[PDB]
């Protein structure tokens, strides 16, 4: 059945950004028959990453996951047909458990783990301001494979299209739930994959990010979507 | 005498970050004498930031600082002369706990703090891409008033040029201890200043913002730097 990962990066229980991300969760729910994991820092424990980037990428290793809800949520995601990420833009950036969760799971960076999944991030500022985060949110997830079906960028100053918003959100996700939109990756990805592809190729046969290509058969492919469609 | 406050904000103790920050910090002792307060997550406790805007913008009420180490961390600031935050760079962000700092000093970001004292920024990023880092933490500490004296980023790359950056900015450091370079606004802080004065102007007259700019006179100066001239 279609399942939905949600995380709402707030640690204010007053938030705003969960108030909307919840009354997305809402009206998703009740237009459609989906399987939605809520989850956010008040019902699940995400240390802050402490990872080192030789042992994460040279040897895949772990050491916080196993400590707290790491191991279920990357579960979850792996296991999710659409994520959607939620964040207050406080300080012209995402919050600090929003950036959290994105270091957490650094260590899929360069496996492209998230293919054929469908992102939609919103992102709500109380002040506005000109902020980059929608494009933040956007690099860092489609990088890491998925398609960005939507984003959602809401501010106080114009909170009275909120829910507009997030009904087009809805009607966007409901196109993948009735399969009118299939995974189809962007030139920004396509350049990504050449380029670690070239990189990879040249690591220890003992590497871990180089194993992980070899097993996932990612090398033999031509593109990253005729990967995914081909072998995955 | 002079005094330094240093705030490194890393998780790994092996953290390349820490260590240049270390090396900037032995630099500047060995040929300078000043009072340097250094901080990280290891030796310092900072709960991630949990304020809500209406609650600390209008009433000054933050739950936290008298909690952990946000206090006494908020005094060091406060009577430093040279600041110096320095953070990894992974994912093309800051990192969590650097990100951290800047939302538990969020109550501060229309109150101009910070006039006065010169800050030194530095990023390290382990890998060769694009980010900007060093623009979006000058972004911030200018907006609370400081002067960005220099700002260093260092790259691991084929040229290895970290140690004559961090000289660089021990040079930049020591103009300001030995007093032959004093405060100075920018156009973009004083068109902040100017910005900020016409909204909190209209503000409640009990609102907490806007009593801070009557009781320190910030309503009758011509700008933010006559302000500081006249006032401090």
């Given at each position: 059945?279609?399942?939905?990962?949600?995380?709402?990066?707030?640690?204010?229980?007053?938030?705003?950004?969960?108030?909307?991300?919840?009354?997305?969760?809402?009206?998703?729910?009740?237009?459609?028959?989906?399987?939605?994991?809520?989850?956010?820092?008040?019902?699940?424990?995400?240390?802050?990453?402490?990872?080192?980037?030789?042992?994460?990428?040279?040897?895949?290793?772990?050491?916080?996951?196993?400590a707290?809800?790491?191991?279920?949520?990357?579960?979850?995601?792996?296991?999710?047909?659409?994520?959607?990420?939620?964040?207050?833009?406080?300080?012209?950036?995402?919050?600090?458990?929003?950036?959290?969760?994105?270091?957490?799971?650094?260590?899929?960076?360069?496996?492209?783990?998230?293919?054929?999944?469908?992102?939609?991030?919103?992102d709500?500022?109380?002040?506005?301001?000109?902020?980059?985060?929608?494009?933040?949110?956007?690099?860092?997830f489609?990088?890491?494979?998925?398609?960005?079906?939507?984003?959602?960028?809401?501010?106080?100053?114009?909170?009275?299209?909120?829910?507009?918003?997030?009904?087009?959100?809805?009607?966007?996700?409901?196109?993948?739930?009735?399969?009118?939109?299939?995974?189809?990756?962007?030139?920004?990805?396509?350049?990504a994959?050449?380029?670690?592809?070239?990189?990879?190729?040249?690591?220890?046969?003992?590497?871990?990010?180089?194993?992980?290509?070899?097993?996932?058969?990612?090398?033999?492919?031509?593109?990253?979507?005729?990967?995914?469609?081909?072998?995955?």
């Open positions: 059945m279609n399942k939905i990962f949600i995380y709402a990066g707030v640690r204010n229980h007053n938030s705003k950004t969960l108030e909307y991300t919840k009354r997305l969760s809402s009206i998703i729910s009740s237009r459609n028959n989906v399987d939605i994991s809520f989850r956010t820092p008040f019902n699940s424990e995400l240390e802050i990453s402490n990872s080192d980037s030789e042992e994460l990428f040279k040897k895949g290793i772990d050491r916080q996951s196993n707290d809800d790491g191991g279920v949520i990357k579960k979850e995601l792996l296991e999710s047909d659409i994520i959607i990420i939620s964040s207050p833009v406080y300080l012209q950036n995402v919050s600090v458990d929003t950036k959290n969760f994105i270091e957490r799971i650094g260590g899929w960076s360069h496996l492209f783990r998230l293919a054929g999944k469908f992102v939609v991030t919103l709500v500022a109380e002040s506005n301001g000109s902020d980059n985060v929608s494009e933040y949110l956007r690099d860092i489609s990088y890491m494979g998925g398609q960005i079906l939507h984003q959602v960028s809401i501010t106080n100053s114009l909170k009275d299209i909120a829910e507009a918003q997030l009904m087009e959100a809805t009607y966007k996700i409901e196109d993948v739930l009735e399969g009118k939109i299939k995974y189809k990756t962007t030139d920004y990805q396509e350049r994959y050449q380029t670690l592809k070239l990189i990879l190729e040249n690591y220890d046969s003992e590497h871990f990010e180089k194993m992980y290509w070899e097993k996932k058969r990612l090398f033999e492919a031509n593109s990253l979507e005729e990967w995914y469609y081909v072998e995955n």
